[PDB]
Symmetry: C3
Subunit: 202 residues, 3 copies
């Protein structure tokens, strides 16, 4: 019951895409079932993941049942400049400067980007390198996320700050304990109205 | 004197600049004041800039008179909201049995109408988020993302936008808010534009 | 040794990487240093990214040497300012009699010149607003909207952009600003790039 998570366009609105089957080809990306992208101009969500180079070995992980709005970009580590001195990339220009290519160990590595489960990322958000966004978070439209966001927080702005906890700490801990997104789908299917009103916690 | 406010493209040889009223005229739940203009980024008409505006949610957009709206400004109405009392995942969108989980109107966030006042200047690429009110005479800086209301004759900027300063002293603002020159017939405004432009109109 | 700073496309067959000086040399009231480059978003040349820059307003844009400008960066000069001692509504633009209310140059906000120093990295999709100074060695985070000055060798980010941290301890900063490697003869630069890249140039 419900849609086929392996369909790229599950709604017979071609804007709405399931991201897992699109991004499965991608090295160093892991994406959960049912998470979707609402395309801005028809682009597929793989075009929204920028500067992701296997040699840098940074990973992107997105959980299940995420909602990603149009124009969201995810910036991986590939646009980092060397920063222990001049940021000018002499190496890029050749003509003898190519001898000054940075070693891998001289490039900033800001870490992996990990977006949890049941996360809603609003329109035109930018997620910068090395960010972790906890389960159940909401990131407001047009946010620029540079630091981690805790579970079940509403966050917004540029740079994105935590605005408030969505629910009481206790409800949050219970939701984090039960992880409904990892239930068998036939069990999710029996309980969507309760997942939608938080009465799953009891 | 001046152009006819019902002319969609009032400036001979600059078709970027649109009077919004005659363009927005076709739109349900949108009211827009005379002389307010949009300066198009790439020729798009301003209706394309009003997003997620769905008649079923019954939220209204109101924009006053004599507003200046820069290129790329978007106005986000309540249609982007997710249900929020539990999971934000919109199961219902996907059908195949999930549509039984459609939220009722009263389970969705209702952030309110969007009301932009008179004589407001909204800069390039500003985003106006649902439910916000912006008072008469305000200035919103380019690239702002406005989530909270902005008071009359305030300069605001940032993402999220914050009030930076009052443009004028409170007494002046109070007087401007009393006189409401923007409500005068244009043939009365026409005699007074110089005093409107330098604030001596309160005298 | 090294590339030709007078080529608009210093790498043969690559129209993404652009030297900004040769491109903007034709422009009045712009001064740009050698080797500063733009990394194009979609193949647009950097002159397209300089907005609202009108000779008659007499504001200058200056960019130093060895700057890295990321894709989609825009620089906003003074030509989008509105008159704001009273109504911001630009009656004059619409003619039909209202062109008599054109603001004199000295009635418009003059926010000043925009000056970007040497060895500055401006990240993707930054907006630089009017009248801003950015010091040597600064890094401006992607998506920043820069409304106030940024001191030399500071990391800055946000909208509005704030200083986040000094890149290096003050003694290191002071020495770098003393020696100004970017003003050395290119033959000297070439012999020392490895030291410039690790800051051991100061020792």
């Amino acid at each position: 019951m419900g849609p086929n998570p392996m369909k790229m366009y599950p709604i017979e609105n071609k804007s709405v895409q399931f991201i897992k089957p699109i991004l499965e080809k991608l090295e160093n990306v892991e994406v959960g079932e049912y998470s979707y992208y609402d395309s801005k101009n028809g682009e597929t969500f793989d075009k929204q993941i920028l500067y992701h180079y296997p040699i840098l070995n940074d990973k992107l992980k997105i959980g299940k049942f995420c909602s990603i709005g149009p124009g969201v970009t995810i910036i991986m580590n590939g646009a980092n400049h060397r920063m222990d001195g001049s940021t000018y990339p002499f190496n890029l220009f050749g003509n003898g400067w190519e001898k000054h290519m940075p070693k891998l160990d001289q490039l900033p590595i800001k870490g992996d980007t990990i977006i949890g489960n049941d996360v809603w990322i609003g329109k035109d958000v930018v997620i910068m390198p090395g960010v972790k966004i906890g389960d159940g978070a909401i990131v407001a439209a047009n946010s620029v996320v540079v630091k981690d966001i805790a579970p079940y927080m509403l966050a917004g702005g540029n740079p994105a700050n935590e605005i408030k906890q969505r629910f009481d700490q206790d409800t949050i801990n219970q939701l984090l304990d039960i992880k409904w997104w990892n239930w068998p789908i036939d069990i999710i299917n029996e309980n969507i109205d309760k997942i939608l009103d938080n009465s799953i916690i009891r």
